[PDB]
Amino acid sequence: GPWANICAGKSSNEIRTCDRHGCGQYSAQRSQRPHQGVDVLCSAGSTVYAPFTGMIVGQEKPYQNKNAINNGVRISGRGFCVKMFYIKPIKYKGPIKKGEKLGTLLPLQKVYPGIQSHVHIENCDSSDPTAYL
Amino acid sequence: GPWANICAGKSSNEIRTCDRHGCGQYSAQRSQRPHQGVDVLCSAGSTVYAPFTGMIVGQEKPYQNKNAINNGVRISGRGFCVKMFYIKPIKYKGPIKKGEKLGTLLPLQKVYPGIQSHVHIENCDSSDPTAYL
Numbered sequence: 001g002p003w004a005n006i007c008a009g010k011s012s013n014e015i016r017t018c019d020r021h022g023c024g025q026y027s028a029q030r031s032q033r034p035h036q037g038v039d040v041l042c043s044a045g046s047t048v049y050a051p052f053t054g055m056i057v058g059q060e061k062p063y064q065n066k067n068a069i070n071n072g073v074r075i076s077g078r079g080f081c082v083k084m085f086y087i088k089p090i091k092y093k094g095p096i097k098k099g100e101k102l103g104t105l106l107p108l109q110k111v112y113p114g115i116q117s118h119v120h121i122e123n124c125d126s127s128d129p130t131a132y133l
Numbered sequence: 134g135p136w137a138n139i140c141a142g143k144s145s146n147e148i149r150t151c152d153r154h155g156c157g158q159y160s161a162q163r164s165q166r167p168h169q170g171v172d173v174l175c176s177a178g179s180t181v182y183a184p185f186t187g188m189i190v191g192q193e194k195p196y197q198n199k200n201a202i203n204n205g206v207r208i209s210g211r212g213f214c215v216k217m218f219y220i221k222p223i224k225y226k227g228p229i230k231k232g233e234k235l236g237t238l239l240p241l242q243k244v245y246p247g248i249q250s251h252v253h254i255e256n257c258d259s260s261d262p263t264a265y266l
């Protein structure tokens with residue numbers, strides 16, 4: 001698909017399969033409700049890059065409570081609007097270019113030891129983003 | 134083998150198979166001399182545990198020039214003696230028990246993008262450690 005490879009160490013945007021914590025695909029089984037995004041493979045500590053050109057809209061945290069991975073952002077532009085979780089970003093507002101450094105992946109293995117480390121990416125309307133990867 | 138599972142969140146010690154950069158088995162191809170140890174699969178940022186009971190007997194860096202993974206230790210005791218690379222250890226010297234936290238795996242993807250993240254473990258005499266894993 002159209003998006004840039006998001007994770008510094010990767011040829012493409014590969015998706016988390018199934019590990020001891022769960023599975024990474026859109027609508028994957030979760031406890032209250034299905035998985036609302038897609039988990040894109042990425043090594044803890046890695047540089048993450050913008051999937052598309054647009055504007056960082058704001059900080060957007062994945063969780064209501066503090067943990068080692070509780071940061072992220074919303075980005076919109078070029079027909080796309082995503083929330084990207086488990087990243088410490090460079091900035092919480094302003095312009096960003098496709099493939100530009102967006103931030104660093106936070107300590108996935110500290111929070112979920114044995115997970116396939118990933119960025120969780122979600123369309124802003126919670127629709128399936130898989131086609132764009 | 135008698136050694137503890139090294140990588141938090143894994144079930145057992147599993148050896149890196151071949152990727153872009155090379156292969157993880159003992160005596161696998163490397164540039165001027167064969168692979169002197171075994172590469173145990175482990176995710177960047179995972180806790181790493183001591184494979185056996187002994188003494189941490191100093192820092193052992195893998196490389197002459199600094200990079201994100203350039204740390205490790207030597208451990209000896211109970212008739213074993215190993216070097217373990219790519220870990221930030223809890224300490225450089227002192228007692229450790231089999232299965233106790235030794236440290237945390239450094240971010241291999243910053244140095245060798247596309248490698249399977251792993252701990253490199255080597256017997257101090259460079260004999261094959263595979264049977265102990």
Ligand SMILES: [Zn+2]
Nearest residue numbers: 037038039120
């Ligand atoms: Zn997810």
Ligand SMILES: [Zn+2]
Nearest residue numbers: 170171172253
């Ligand atoms: Zn090795």
